[PDB]
Design an enzyme around this catalytic site. Structure first.
Site, PDB file in Angstrom:
ATOM      1  CD  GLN D  11       1.407   4.897  -4.573  1.00 53.45           C
ATOM      2  OE1 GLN D  11       0.243   5.064  -4.216  1.00 53.45           O
ATOM      3  NE2 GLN D  11       2.442   5.102  -3.765  1.00 53.45           N
ATOM      4  CB  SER D 140       5.040  -1.034   0.954  1.00 54.15           C
ATOM      5  OG  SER D 140       4.222   0.120   0.980  1.00 54.15           O
ATOM      6  CB  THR D 179      11.785   7.870  -0.040  1.00 51.61           C
ATOM      7  OG1 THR D 179      10.755   7.020   0.473  1.00 51.61           O
ATOM      8  CG2 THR D 179      12.788   7.018  -0.790  1.00 51.61           C
ATOM      9  CG  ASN D 206      14.333  -1.290  -3.349  1.00 48.93           C
ATOM     10  OD1 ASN D 206      14.610  -1.042  -2.176  1.00 48.93           O
ATOM     11  ND2 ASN D 206      13.976  -0.349  -4.216  1.00 48.93           N
ATOM     12  CD  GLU D 254       1.315 -28.984   7.102  1.00 48.31           C
ATOM     13  OE1 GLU D 254       0.727 -28.208   6.319  1.00 48.31           O
ATOM     14  OE2 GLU D 254       0.716 -29.816   7.815  1.00 48.31           O
TER      15      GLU D 254
END
Ligand SMILES: Nc1nc2c(ncn2[C@@H]2O[C@H](COP(=O)(O)OP(=O)(O)OP(=O)(O)O)[C@@H](O)[C@H]2O)c(=O)[nH]1
Ligand SMILES: Nc1nc2c(ncn2[C@@H]2O[C@H](COP(=O)(O)OP(=O)(O)OP(=O)(O)O)[C@@H](O)[C@H]2O)c(=O)[nH]1
Ligand SMILES: Nc1nc2c(ncn2[C@@H]2O[C@H](COP(=O)(O)OP(=O)(O)OP(=O)(O)O)[C@@H](O)[C@H]2O)c(=O)[nH]1
Lengths: 31, 427, 608, 438, 427
Positions: D11, D140, D179, D206, D254
């Protein structure tokens, strides 16, 4: 109603920009 | 942004605050409930220096009122703006200190400092960057002095990097009513001179004098006195909240005023006061404005520095004005009495210019002087203290509270230091 | 004073608000800050006013000579009770003693004294003497260990007995006349802890009943002050029993919040008569003896029923929401259309008769407009969509899908019926070509950066101006597709209109002003202050420059002169903040619509 | 011919995916019906979509990517959303349990019975695809579930198909925001499991995304709306090569070769110069010189690793729009003359360039400007190693006190792997210094 | 799908779970009769977290209430939602509890274990795939403890694979009413720490503190207490049933919470605490919300953690949020007191963002903490046990019940083991 992602309401009337946020301490920041 | 948080100590401070605040609000055009009616774009912009915001256009302010008697604050609540004042800020005690400065200073405060510190730190973290804060009370105010001493003591080490205004009204030289007032006065000022930076001297007798001079309305109210002093404080604060060609920073004003750490005490002076015929018998010209400004009769803060000398002067003007008149008028006074100043540093003047007029009048001003005009006051307190401590009357209460005369001893040594430093610096 | 002719709306949110006069000819209800009396047969309307705020509660005297009313105010303030003479339609008296709000009024059976129930923070009952214009007495209603009471009701054979109930609280009283004192008595209910929605007293005073929050029925003997019997052994009704009504002989009329209208008995409370309706039942009452009777919904629907056949007649309704806009067919003053949440409604003016409704699942509107031929209708939806519907069938011709993404707020369709100019919440204005079959992106103009409020297209079909929520207005080159000029102000521009010669433009933003700006060069023509309290949500200007109209939060519609620039006629009674103005062509009426859903055809005072 | 497959886990990745397919449907003007308008575009899947979608004769585009998810809420929501008709039902591989941030929970417990499913999806895409130059991995490191499944699937695809390419993208551990503290655990697990097979990984953060946002985009309160807007814009910029043609053509292979001096390290950074608000674009101007200045501006990197603390090894720049090679090489020569920017002596050349004529268009509901000259920048420098030094000193103390390891040992592992990972790390840093030094 | 089935025991839990279900039904928009009114599609979808659909649009609670005295559940049935639950669901006892831990632990339970096990496995098979179960009772409840011990013990060997949430309330430290409450609490906790994983901590005295502070309606009810605590519990449960950028799994949270198996007890942190005027006096913003959240008065669980240090913390925001403000607020607290946290492990904050706001409000929040504030509580209970067992007060009842003295040894020993472990870490 809430399941919408188009904007976030500023807690104040940015018309007045009560919560005066600066452009990273450099000017105007609301809209 | 940079902000200020207001403090309301002692029962005088209680009323003087409500008056000052309604003055601010009426200047700012909000209805008593809080649903403002748009007229003033500039203050609309700059309100965030002194108010916070709620939903639906309500401007929640930033202050703390502290006392011990619930009736005074419920009378304030019944005052015209209790709805604008916050129960969140309604912190208090359930008793009285007996006006016993020491009872407050050690016993009563020990259990209320907790809540007041919680509230003030809540405010401090809610705001981002204060310039500092201001305090309103009486030096002769028993609860005011007792609470103010402790709170300033704590907040110094808490945030040692901020501005700490003290507006404290001075009791009447002719009559004190409360006779332990010299006790409380010297006790407070002992730590005050160490702690504070800016102090205002205000005297009820001189306010009565001005009443007789121009107010002339026979039967005034202490509320009207509050009106006057609140006008003075509004004048000293507007520079921050307004446009106009002036550096408004009270810190810059203070450093203008200070070559020396020990000059703590300052004598405010306001601008036009009027009789009921002189509105139309007076022509609004800067020359007569300033001539009225510098007057011994206009002198209302502490006393006439006529017998003394003018050390430092800072005059702010409000309303539209031109540089030429202020420049020439300072030259005029400089030359009218060049002798009457002090040679140590010529041009002891700083002037400030706010273009925004007040409401109900166009041209106004404020002026703050630190001159040699407190020697009378502290020499008076000296004789009173000495006469008291020849025999130590009323002292058994303070013994029962648990202190000792030795504290009074260092206090009187400190005020003797003040005597000597003032006198040696002036002559 | 701007004068009204037609009114449309009722506060469907007042429990037991609808009342019937003993004449069996006047159906009466509060309408916001206004109170309305209706001829049952000849539908003539009678308004009274002077309320400091929206009316909350009301009751009629048994003689139907006296009207007790009460409004709701802001915290820390007193509310108003107004007694009114019926035949005189006149303000007898005003009282302001409670604080916060008032929710229950009661005439004594012989119309001797009055009972008022103050707000939850007030929390007190007060009786007033009509003979001598003063409260008889008052007291905090309940004991300290209970929640708030809800509804009061007198006896039906004594002016000295009455009851109230609420959050687990049930009390009866005795009016001690010689001491002018109150005597309370809370009742016992065993272990049934409930909260009351509806209350009713037996005409013979043998018993009294209440519909709880749980949809149960409580039967109560007052003399013993003992529980008599309960509601339906089983099968309670969802959303409680909001309203009630006894019958002269026996048997009870019950309205649930589920819109379930029933009549049943007691020994069984088994459902005798059932119909399901549209809108949770908020009021029930009887026309005289109740062979015919009426009910009012939360949806602000009004139904008339004869108990004989037990069928219903929806005889009146209105939008129950903030009517985002209205519009009329062009050139005529016979009908119009009204956007609101859940629907659009076309109405016929002089009959006030809703010509057509549109079922709209799950939606709030924002913008609407007709088309010039009386064949097409175009809309503007907060889901970012558009629709087109037929003129006399109301069928969906087309749904422009994802027409916007943050909703559609401001609409306009050209008089030539070919182009749509739209301003949105993201700050776009899209003009698109139209047809009966296909619609494609002319372009998505991207200049504004907040919500858009109002649009006005020039009659030359060559320019356009728009008011939005950033402080900017743009007059536009409709042909070259570029901004003509800009109007920025110390305001958030919400409503705008042109000049007939198009050499001026009139606007009201958030600056509580009315502004005339010159289109030629960009120099202001004139400023005036428009609303003494709030903003002007709607303006509408005469086609020939005689006058115009402004209205909004000030709840005052204000016809201003244009050749003089002065307030010519002010109309009041609008409880919702007045949202939109619409001019009947022929110079006959203004239609003022307010956020309460009140629609008002105000008559034309000057000459047409 | 020219196409690629993309994979999307967790998610974490689901919304960013959904957003980027919104982006693709925008630039192609795709209609939510599933078919183009009266414009003649439909075929067997050989047009602008030929790399992206699979539009058969039915006229319905089928994108060339897979979502593997374990938390049904998000996948059901998107199934109830707008493009579900576009979306084939069961390629939205959905699970019924969550890995509780545990790499090994997602790596042993549920994976085995789902990786076979995903493999069948792989092979049934493989039969229909023709060129399929490589694979775009969206995962992630702070994967509550993006970690373990990604690891094991990468293992299986590495062992089965070792001739082709797989391009990896995660969100990095924040330098200071956590977190989770299982975060260093599973991040390092994934890293060391990938070190011996992972092809090329490009990394985003982020925090820095928001930093640029409130730096010039004026938005105090953006959301993943804008976040995904920009990252999807980045990947769209890199895939414009496939979509349109340009002054020169460059390929992922490349990118790998010219972006690998030496093995182990395949973890460069991207930076997109022309980021500006609509109004600031309106009343200012764009050109290659200032966009180069910005793209080499230290804070404009989307990772807070200091360039004037680092030394650069690889640099690749690609432009979209109308420019001339004369000014292009002028700007690059100015950079080569510049002294602050520090390549190593080992490489005289450190640039590879690409150009496309196609200007990326604007997106409805977007926030950026109306671009006419754009550039994306992928570079590998030495400064990244501090991001691993911080993780190692964070990790050593907590491993030395054995916090939360009881969960893993109870559900079936030991500390031998945790040992191995530590010297795997130490090797990667020491190699970084040994190649930074001359 | 993945769902939870609830255990409601203890005479307190009798009120508590009633308040719980009424609160959740208020959330979920169903009439008291059970005929759901279509208002919220998503909650219509995800009701299967708790409820099982019957015929005719009614979804049965997956809750099992147990007690011993009929009048309790009879008053419950007299409550506004007794009709919701089934006579199928009402297991109970045939005798007097006696509020004796051992009486509830050995004799009476020996023949109700069969029934309760059958019913719980009934519901277990009824539901399909499980995360675990939660229990609501009191450690100071002499029958809740007695029954929960046995039932948890049996379900342990039944299924060691799920999440065994526990929600017990703590009796009043100043007054236990029940004088053998230390006996009861020791007996329970000694093996509950062996068994459970997650545990909530609540103090009635702290609830009373909160009520005095902000409720200000003078006289509350323990029902109002239930309203608040059920609000907190419902809020922490909302994550699973709701969409939004948050990893809802209570295991996702517990793994974060527990570096060491011996950690089981957790304290709550809630969102706005409102008074008479604060509604219109309050602008609902995340910064002040975080301030209020991290405030000793807002922490409502046991006593002041000011004495010690925080180990781990987990905050959930409900409503319309963004990652940036919550992240920066965590940074702000981190900067303000890096001291007050623990050097041991940095960044102990675990955050969740539920998108769906509750009803009657827009922004809300919850917080669960693991720190050092239960220390005073259990050292209190330890010295209480010493002072009561020293002379074996009230022993003959438990002897006749069949207990001897030996078990208390390892009971208090396990207590001291936990004592030493907690202090060994936190210092
Ligand atoms: N508010 C108010 N204060 C007055 C007035 N007249 C004199 N005062 C003086 O203002 C002083 C300050 O009040 P506080 O600072 O609150 O003093 P306290 O600590 O409460 O102890 P007291 O001095 O006994 O009142 C009092 O001591 C009075 O002597 C008046 O009319 N209004
Ligand atoms: N990629 C991505 N990351 C996000 C998003 N929102 C927050 N994040 C950050 O990225 C992390 C997501 O990783 P995980 O929570 O492990 O996701 P997962 O492995 O699929 O399993 P879950 O625990 O159920 O989410 C979070 O810890 C956030 O810090 C998002 O929309 N997309
Ligand atoms: N329901 C409810 N419980 C309360 C209340 N006040 C205190 N409690 C406590 O909550 C505790 C838990 O109840 P149970 O677990 O059912 O107790 P028990 O084992 O049945 O026996 P006792 O605790 O002695 O009543 C009780 O012991 C009470 O002391 C209240 O107002 N309502």
């Amino acid at each position: 109603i809430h399941s919408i992602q188009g904007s976030i309401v500023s807690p104040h009337t940015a018309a007045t920009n009560g919560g005066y946020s600066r452009k990273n301490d450099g000017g105007f920041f609301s809209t | 942004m940079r902000e200020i948080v207001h403090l309301q100590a002692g029962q005088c401070g209680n009323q003087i605050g409500a008056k000052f605040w309604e003055v601010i609000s009426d200047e700012h055009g909000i209805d008593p409930t809080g649903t403002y009616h748009g007229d003033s774009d500039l203050q609309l912009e700059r309100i965030n220096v002194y108010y916070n915001e709620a939903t639906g256009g309500k401007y929640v302010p930033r202050a703390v009122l502290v006392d011990l008697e619930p009736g005074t604050m419920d009378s304030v609540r019944s005052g015209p703006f209790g709805q604008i004042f916050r129960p969140d800020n309604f912190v208090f005690g359930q008793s009285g200190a007996g006006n016993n400065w020491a009872k407050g200073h050690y016993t009563e405060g020990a259990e209320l400092v907790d809540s007041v510190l919680d509230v003030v730190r809540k405010e401090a973290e809610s705001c981002d960057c204060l310039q500092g804060f201001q305090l309103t009370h009486s030096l002769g105010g028993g609860t005011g002095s007792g609470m103010g001493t402790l709170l300033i003591s704590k907040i110094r080490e808490e945030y040692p990097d901020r501005i700490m205004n003290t507006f404290s009204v001075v009791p009447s030289p002719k009559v004190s009513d409360t006779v332990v007032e010299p006790y409380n006065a010297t006790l407070s000022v002992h730590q005050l001179v160490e702690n504070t930076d800016e102090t205002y001297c205000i005297d009820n007798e001189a306010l009565y004098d001005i009443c007789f001079r121009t107010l002339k309305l026979t039967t005034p109210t202490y509320g009207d006195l509050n009106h006057l002093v609140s006008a003075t404080m509004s004048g000293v604060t507007t520079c921050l909240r307004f446009p106009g060609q002036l550096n408004a920073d009270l810190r810059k004003l203070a450093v203008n005023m200070v070559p020396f750490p020990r000059l703590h005490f300052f004598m405010p002076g306001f601008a036009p006061l009027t009789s009921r015929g002189s509105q139309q018998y007076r022509a609004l010209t800067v020359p007569e404005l300033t001539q009225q400004m510098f007057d011994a009769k206009n002198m209302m803060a502490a006393c006439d520095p006529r017998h003394g000398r003018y050390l430092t002067v800072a005059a702010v003007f409000r309303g539209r004005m031109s540089m030429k008149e202020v420049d020439e008028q300072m030259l005029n006074v400089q030359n009218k009495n060049s002798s009457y100043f002090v040679e140590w540093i010529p041009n002891n003047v700083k002037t400030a210019v706010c273009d925004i007029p007040p409401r109900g009048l166009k041209m106004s001003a404020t002026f703050i002087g630190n001159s040699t005009a407190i020697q009378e006051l502290f020499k008076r307190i000296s004789e009173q203290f000495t006469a008291m401590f020849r025999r130590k009357a009323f002292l058994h209460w303070y013994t029962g509270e648990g202190m000792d005369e030795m504290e009074f001893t260092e206090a009187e040594s400190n005020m003797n230091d003040l005597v000597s430093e003032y006198q040696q610096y002036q002559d | 004073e701007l004068e009204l002719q037609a009114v449309i709306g009722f506060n469907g949110h007042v429990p037991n608000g609808l009342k019937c006069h003993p004449d069996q000819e006047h159906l009466i209800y509060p309408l916001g800050c206004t109170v309305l009396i209706q001829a049952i047969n000849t539908n003539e309307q009678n308004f009274l006013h002077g309320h400091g705020n929206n009316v909350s509660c009301v009751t009629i005297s048994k003689e139907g000579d006296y009207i007790a009313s009460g409004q709701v105010t802001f915290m820390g303030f007193k509310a108003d009770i107004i007694l009114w003479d019926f035949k005189k339609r006149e303000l007898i008296a005003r009282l302001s003693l409670h604080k916060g709000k008032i929710e229950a009024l009661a005439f004594s059976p012989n119309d001797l004294y009055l009972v008022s129930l103050g707000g939850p923070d007030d929390g007190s009952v007060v009786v007033w003497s009509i003979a001598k214009r003063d409260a008889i007495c008052g007291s905090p209603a309940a004991g300290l260990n209970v929640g708030n009471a809800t509804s009061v009701v007198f006896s039906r054979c004594r002016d000295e007995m009455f009851v109230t109930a609420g959050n687990g609280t049930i009390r009866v009283w005795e009016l001690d006349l010689p001491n002018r004192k109150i005597w309370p008595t809370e009742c016992q209910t065993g272990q049934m802890k409930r909260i009351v929605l509806s209350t009713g007293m037996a005409d013979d005073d043998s018993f009294f009943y209440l519909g709880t929050t749980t949809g149960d029925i409580l039967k109560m003997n007052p003399k013993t002050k003992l529980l008599a019997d309960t509601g339906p052994v089983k099968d309670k009704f969802s959303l409680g029993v909001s309203a009630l009504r006894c019958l002269k002989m026996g048997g009870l009329l019950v309205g649930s919040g589920a819109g379930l209208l029933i009549f049943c008995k007691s020994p069984s409370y088994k459902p005798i008569k059932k119909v399901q309706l549209q809108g949770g039942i908020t009021s029930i009452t009887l026309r005289g003896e109740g062979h015919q009777f009426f009910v009012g919904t939360e949806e602000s629907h009004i139904y008339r029923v004869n108990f004989t056949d037990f069928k219903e007649t929806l005889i009146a309704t209105c939008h129950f929401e903030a009517v985002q806009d209205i519009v009329f067919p062009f050139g005529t003053a016979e009908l119009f259309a009204t956007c609101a949440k859940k629907d659009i409604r076309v109405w016929h003016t002089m009959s006030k008769r809703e010509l057509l409704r549109i079922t709209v699942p799950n939606m709030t509107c924002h913008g609407i407009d007709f088309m010039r031929d009386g064949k097409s209708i175009i809309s503007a939806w907060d889901d970012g969509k558009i629709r087109a519907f037929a003129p006399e069938s109301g069928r969906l011709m087309y749904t422009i899908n994802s027409a916007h993404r943050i909703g559609v707020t401001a609409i306009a369709t050209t008089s030539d019926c070919k182009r749509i100019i739209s301003g949105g919440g993201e700050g776009e204005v899209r003009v698109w070509q139209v047809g009966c079959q296909t619609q494609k992106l002319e372009e998505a103009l991207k200049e504004h950066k907040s919500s858009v409020s109002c649009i006005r297209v020039k009659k030359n079909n060559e320019e356009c101006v728009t008011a939005s929520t950033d402080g900017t207005c743009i007059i536009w080159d409709l042909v070259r597709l570029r901004r003509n000029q800009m109007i920025l102000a110390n305001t958030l521009f919400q409503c705008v209109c042109y000049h007939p010669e198009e050499f001026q433009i009139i606007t009201s933003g958030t600056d509580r002003k009315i502004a005339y700006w010159e289109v030629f060069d960009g120099s202001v023509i004139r400023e005036l202050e428009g609303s003494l309290s709030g903003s002007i949500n709607g303006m509408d200007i005469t086609q020939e420059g005689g006058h115009f109209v402004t209205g909004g939060h000030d709840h005052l519609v204000k016809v201003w002169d244009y050749n003089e620039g002065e307030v010519t006629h002010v109309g009041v009674g609008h409880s919702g903040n007045i949202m939109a103005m619409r001019i009947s062509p022929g110079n006959q009426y203004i239609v003022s619509v307010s956020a309460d859903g009140a629609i008002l055809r105000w008559k034309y005072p000057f000459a047409s | 011919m020219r196409e690629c497959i993309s994979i999307h886990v967790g998610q974490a990745g689901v919304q960013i995916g959904n957003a980027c397919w919104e982006l693709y449907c925008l630039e192609h003007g795709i209609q939510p019906d599933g078919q183009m308008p009266s414009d003649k575009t439909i075929g067997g899947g050989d047009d602008s979509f030929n790399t992206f979608f699979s539009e058969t004769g039915a006229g319905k585009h089928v994108p060339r990517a897979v979502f593997v998810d374990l938390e049904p809420t998000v996948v059901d929501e998107v199934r109830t959303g707008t493009y579900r008709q576009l979306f084939h039902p069961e390629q939205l591989i959905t699970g019924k349990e969550d890995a509780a941030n545990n790499y090994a929970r997602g790596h042993y417990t549920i994976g085995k019975e789902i990786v076979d499913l995903v493999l069948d999806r792989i092979r049934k895409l493989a039969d229909l695809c023709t060129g399929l130059q490589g694979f775009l991995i969206f995962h992630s490191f702070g994967g509550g579930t993006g970690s373990g499944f990604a690891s094991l699937l990468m293992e299986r695809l590495s062992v089965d198909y070792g001739k082709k390419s797989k391009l990896e993208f995660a969100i990095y551990p924040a330098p200071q925001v956590s977190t989770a503290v299982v975060e260093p655990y599973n991040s390092i697990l994934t890293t060391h499991t990938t070190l011996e097979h992972s092809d090329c990984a490009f990394m985003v953060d982020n925090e820095a995304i928001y930093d640029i946002c409130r730096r010039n985009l004026d938005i105090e309160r953006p959301t993943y709306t804008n976040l995904n807007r920009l990252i999807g814009q980045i990947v769209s910029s890199i895939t414009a090569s496939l979509r349109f043609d340009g002054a020169l053509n460059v390929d992922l292979t490349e990118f790998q070769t010219n972006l690998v001096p030496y093995p182990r390290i395949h973890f460069p950074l991207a930076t997109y110069a022309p980021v500006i608000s609509a109004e600031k674009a309106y009343h200012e101007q764009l050109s290659v010189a200032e966009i180069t200045n910005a793209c080499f501006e230290p804070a404009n990197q989307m990772v807070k690793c200091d360039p004037r603390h680092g030394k650069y090894m690889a640099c690749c720049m690609l432009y979209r729009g109308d420019v001339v090679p004369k000014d292009v090489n002028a700007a690059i020569a100015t950079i080569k003359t510049k002294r602050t920017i520090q390549f190593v002596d080992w490489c005289p050349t450190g640039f590879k360039v690409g150009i496309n004529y196609q200007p990326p268009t604007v997106v409805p509901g977007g926030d950026l400007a109306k671009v006419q000259r754009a550039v994306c920048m992928l570079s590998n420098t030495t400064a990244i190693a501090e991001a691993w030094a911080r993780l190692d000193h964070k990790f050593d103390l907590m491993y030395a006190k054995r916090a939360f390891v009881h969960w893993y040992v109870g559900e079936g592992m030991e500390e031998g792997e945790f040992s191995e990972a530590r010297e795997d790390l130490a090797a990667l840093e020491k190699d970084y210094e040994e190649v930074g030094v001359d």
